[PDB]
Design a protein around this ligand. Structure first.
Ligand SMILES: O=C(O)CCC(=O)c1cc(-c2c[nH]c3c(F)cccc23)cs1
Ligand SMILES: O=C(O)CCC(=O)c1cc(-c2c[nH]c3c(F)cccc23)cs1
Lengths: 177, 177
């Protein structure tokens, strides 16, 4: 299935390469008002909507700073640059958590494939494939050596057509545990 | 199939985002001994072997310089950095071409999946899936609006067990046309 390959490729081509150096980069930031959490938090919206600006998805998610960059030679790209962003999570006007946060970009591919006739991916299959992506990635990371309390997947389905939804509260549930 | 999804994800998640700005970045480099070619050259080894150092794959492929970086907000990563590398191609001691060059990183995922028992991808399926990746990507890019004489795929199979192979000569065949 499409989602199976995408989950494996996201581990192999991205997470396996950034997760081993992540806690070092975070420790460095914290040492040079509240330490940044030690894990990469990955947003997995099951509606596969991936905005590029996180603060427009919820005003209580506020960009704070960039992590120091990681670079490595990758596939002929000399000093390929991996950048990641740190966010503050607010709750009733209070800073309640700080963490490295981003969306899983493969879900934006599921979204786009579903709109392109030539991709052979029907619009109505997005949700099932997003669920399959989330399950496959969780199963990969549970057994992966580069994941050492390094990463937390935050999967969520914003309520059917309508009701109240808070992305920042979804992240905070995981941060608190 | 695995390769179908990976080809679509490589277009959607990478090429669609860097190709529109590529000729601008190249024009800038050329203006601020022989101009860099106007296209991104993508190496598609059908054996799915993707080294991170290109000059160790062939001594006639020599790193020259980095393209100026492109940055954009991407999935919550503020100023996500896209770096690309420029190479000189030599032939009998002469510089015969200059171009932005890198490997298609999805082929390294096909290679890795084929070695991981949990990925359900048999070792003997690599070649067929690499061929399918190459065909799917060519068909995507042929109809893609962001590809305007912007990109050239270089697919090759290094001779069965043994005979002479020159990666630099493979790239030069395409550069010359
Ligand atoms: O996506 C960004 O730009 C920030 C994260 C990053 O640098 C990378 C992501 C992947 C990747 C592996 N598989 C993918 C897929 F199936 C769809 C989209 C992206 C990817 C390789 S590197
Ligand atoms: O791979 C690098 O780090 C340099 C190029 C780059 O930045 C990106 C690549 C992709 C990607 C989309 N699909 C992929 C897949 F299936 C396997 C591996 C990578 C990718 C997203 S961004």
């Amino acid at each position: 299935n499409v989602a199976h390959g995408l989950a494996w490729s996201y581990y192999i081509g991205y997470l396996r390469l950034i997760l081993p150096e992540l806690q070092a980069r975070i420790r460095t930031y914290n040492q040079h008002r509240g330490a940044v959490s030690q894990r990469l938090y990955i947003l997995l919206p099951l509606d596969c909507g991936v905005p590029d600006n996180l603060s427009m998805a919820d005003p209580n998610i506020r960009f704070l700073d960039k992590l120091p960059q990681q670079t490595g030679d990758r596939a002929g790209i000399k000093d390929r640059v991996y950048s990641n962003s740190i966010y503050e999570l607010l709750e009733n006007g209070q800073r309640a958590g700080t963490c490295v946060l981003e969306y899983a970009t493969p879900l934006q591919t599921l979204f786009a494939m579903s709109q392109y006739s030539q991709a052979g991916f029907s619009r109505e299959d997005r949700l099932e494939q997003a669920k399959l992506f989330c399950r496959t990635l969780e199963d990969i990371l549970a057994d992966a050596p580069e994941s050492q309390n390094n990463c937390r997947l935050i999967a969520y389905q914003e309520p059917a057509d309508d009701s109240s939804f808070s992305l920042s509260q979804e992240v905070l549930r995981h941060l608190r545990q």
